[PDB]
Design a protein around this ligand. Structure first.
Ligand SMILES: C/C(=C\COP(=O)(O)OP(=O)(O)O)CC/C=C(\C)CNC(=O)CCCC[C@@H]1SC[C@@H]2NC(=O)N[C@@H]21
Ligand SMILES: [Zn+2]
Lengths: 315, 401
């Protein structure tokens, strides 16, 4: 009802409906540190929030009061907790509360307390109907918002809502193939549905990632995805892969390719292949090319990788 | 010269492969801006941590803040920790009267249920609990150690603990790896760890490591510096680092250092930011210690496995605000969090030590050296020792008997 931006906003201390109740000031003690010189609207709302809290008053007026207190500091988890208790005691309508939180999140989408609130609402309502399209609109403003992906994954796991996620994932990859949050989602989805062992799946996946690497050679996410889905199989059970990557080299080089080649060679050496000495030299050559020339930022990483390879692939 | 100013360093600019997405448009916006900053040093010929300016910023902030800060009204022990720690790295001694005021303040933030809240009378929460205990350790006095109610602290931790090994961030709260780190940090410093307190936790943190090698905030999520710092450091405390796949974790962090900017990003294909000078690069010492404990023969004996020089160059040239305090990146406004973590970042990038090696790298004038920070707790190593000592004089509650 009475808005903080209304021209006719009146401080709580000046409101006749709160005459019966004493404000409770914050005790910061006698020489405070990190002392915030609160504006007057703020101190006034929070003086009354404290008073309402202290006596645990479960009033409709305390409920409207919490709205204000949140508008002034959406990060006050004490206020949010109290609001949830009131939501219950006053037996409030959660559909409007859902609309409240929708607007709030839209306004401050990078805030833990507010996603968590929404989530608690969804557990109470056991009703995910609004969740994915909601989440999709936030992601539409910030495609990498971490809270939004977390919440997405949580809905999907709890209400088993797997059936369209790979569709959404494919679309976002089309929008920004560099969106790591979306490759993480692809992986999240696939490992929970089919898994990666079905050969047909793994092949579609590897082919896709390679189409994507060719289209955009310096996109690390694709390369990270490639390594992720394969490395654990063992890279060397896929003999064509070595050659298919060597083919790219001339036309589509990138430190990622060079690094992958090393990962293959390392798998080869673990697996007692032929030309041990020759493979080991190709690897150490590449490490040196990385450390000295094509990825000098990681010069310390690459020198430790070369020294590991020498250390254990020897005599 | 400096690494960033050498002419081959230009070959480290983004290659978009002629294919523009939002991800590359944004990265190029930043790189172009960082190139300006680099060129600005190279017009007249000279790298300086404006200590004196940072100190004024901090000294004032520690006492009083405008209503610009109404939104940190629930994070005030964070402000104590960030500012105290920053002063500590700058080798600034903290007056008896400031120290005492913080003790008394943090005492009013302490819940009767145990733990600490964002301010006086707020409910307890793992994050300010973590910050307050760290602030109290940095102070290091007996007054400060005694502010902490250890028995209620444990009860408070018990109340957050979940069947599957995770912790709630607060009662009625959320879980992610942060709670695990906060709990471990706090529990270990105060000597309140029991047999069953962190049971399941290591396995929980481990399920947060994902296909990228890094750790996400909860199982299934994208790998991120902050959560990855928290997970690994939490395992290191518990001594169960080996639950994780360290070789992949290594490949992931090292990759987070930006070839052009010099600093680190929080997750793959996102932007450089100074705070990750601590959250990402602080993983390197933790991993060095872990791989050393497993017998690794190939570990360097002078350097962490990142470009120490380049990181210091990033912090010094791009993340100092001329008025004092430090930044995420240029164009951004100072704050105490970034002041804290850039500096913690800088100290890590200056000070290598392993077993009995010690090797420093101080970019710019030598008055740039910070004091060392402990990479698990991110307070000073002296302070860690003193505090773990003091609280070892006490039994884990109970017992005793
Ligand atoms: C969700 C997330 C990052 C999201 O980043 P983003 O999308 O804005 O940026 P980026 O592109 O990921 O770099 C996790 C980061 C985690 C850490 C840095 C680990 N953090 C801690 O241990 C606590 C640091 C406290 C930050 C302040 S405390 C007051 C305020 N409240 C809060 O919850 N966070 C902030
Ligand atoms: Zn930052």
């Amino acid at each position: 009802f009475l808005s903080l931006d209304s021209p006719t906003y009146v401080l709580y201390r000046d409101r006749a409906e709160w005459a019966d109740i004493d404000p409770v000031p914050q005790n910061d003690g006698p020489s405070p540190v990190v002392q915030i010189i609160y504006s007057e609207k703020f101190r006034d709302v929070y003086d009354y929030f404290r008073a309402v809290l202290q006596r645990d008053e479960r009033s409709e007026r305390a409920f409207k009061l919490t709205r204000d207190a949140i508008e002034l500091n959406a990060a006050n988890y004490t206020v949010w907790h109290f609001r949830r208790v009131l939501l219950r005691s006053l037996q409030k309508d959660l559909q409007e509360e859902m609309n409240y939180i929708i607007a709030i999140i839209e306004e401050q989408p990078k805030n833990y307390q507010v996603w968590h609130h929404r989530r608690v609402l969804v557990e109470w309502l056991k009703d995910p109907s609004q969740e994915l399209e909601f989440i999709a609109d936030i992601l539409n403003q910030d495609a990498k918002n971490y809270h939004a992906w977390q919440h997405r994954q949580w809905v999907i796991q709890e209400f088993r809502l797997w059936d369209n996620e790979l569709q959404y994932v494919d679309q976002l990859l089309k929008e920004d193939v560099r969106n790591n949050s979306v490759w993480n989602q692809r992986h999240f989805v696939i490992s929970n549905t089919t898994g990666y062992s079905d050969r047909a799946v793994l092949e579609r996946e590897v082919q896709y990632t390679l189409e994507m690497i060719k289209l955009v050679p310096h996109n690390e996410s694709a390369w990270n995805y490639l390594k992720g889905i394969l490395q654990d199989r063992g890279l060397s059970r896929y003999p064509n892969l070595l050659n298919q990557l060597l083919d790219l080299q001339p036309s589509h080089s990138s430190p990622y390719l060079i690094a992958f080649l090393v990962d293959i060679y390392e798998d080869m050496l673990e697996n007692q292949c032929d030309n041990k000495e020759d493979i080991l030299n190709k690897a150490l050559e590449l490490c040196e090319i990385l450390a000295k020339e094509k990825d000098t930022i990681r010069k310390e990483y690459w020198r430790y990788i070369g020294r590991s390879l020498q250390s254990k692939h020897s005599r | 010269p400096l690494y960033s100013l050498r002419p081959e360093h230009a070959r480290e600019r983004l290659q978009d492969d002629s294919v523009e997405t939002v991800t590359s448009i944004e990265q190029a916006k930043v790189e172009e801006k960082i190139q300006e900053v680099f060129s600005s040093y190279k017009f007249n010929h000279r790298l300086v941590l404006q200590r004196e300016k940072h100190f004024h910023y901090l000294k004032r902030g520690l006492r009083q803040l405008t209503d610009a800060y109404e939104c940190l009204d629930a994070s005030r022990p964070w402000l104590c920790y960030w500012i105290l720690h920053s002063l500590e790295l700058l080798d600034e001694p903290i007056p008896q009267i400031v120290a005492t005021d913080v003790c008394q303040f943090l005492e009013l933030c302490q819940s009767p249920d145990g733990g600490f809240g964002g301010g006086p009378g707020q409910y307890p929460h793992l994050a300010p609990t973590y910050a307050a205990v760290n602030a109290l350790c940095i102070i290091g006095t007996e007054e400060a150690y005694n502010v902490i109610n250890r028995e209620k602290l444990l009860q408070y931790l018990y109340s957050l603990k979940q069947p599957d090994g995770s912790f709630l961030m607060h009662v009625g709260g959320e879980v992610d790896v942060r709670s695990a780190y906060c709990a471990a940090s706090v529990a270990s410093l105060t000597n309140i760890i029991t047999p069953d307190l962190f049971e399941g936790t290591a396995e929980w943190i481990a399920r947060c490591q994902n296909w990228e090698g890094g750790i996400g905030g909860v199982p299934g999520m994208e790998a991120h510096g902050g959560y990855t710092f928290c997970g690994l450091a939490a395992l290191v405390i518990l001594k169960k680092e080996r639950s994780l796949n360290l070789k992949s974790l290594l490949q992931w962090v090292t990759s987070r250092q930006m070839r052009f900017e010099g600093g680190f990003q929080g997750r793959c294909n996102k932007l450089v930011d100074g705070c990750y000078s601590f959250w990402q690069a602080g993983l390197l010492p933790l991993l060095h210690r872990a791989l050393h404990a497993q017998g690794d023969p190939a570990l360097s004996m002078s350097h962490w496995m990142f470009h120490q020089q380049a990181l210091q160059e990033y912090i010094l040239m791009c993340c100092q605000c001329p008025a004092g305090g430090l930044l995420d990146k240029p164009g951004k406004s100072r704050d105490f969090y970034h002041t804290c973590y850039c500096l913690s970042g800088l100290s890590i990038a200056q000070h290598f030590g392993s077993g009995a090696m010690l090797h420093d790298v101080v970019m710019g004038v030598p008055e740039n050296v910070l004091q060392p920070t402990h990479p698990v707790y991110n307070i000073g190593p002296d302070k860690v020792i003193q505090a773990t000592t003091h609280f070892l004089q006490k039994p884990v509650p109970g017992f005793e008997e």
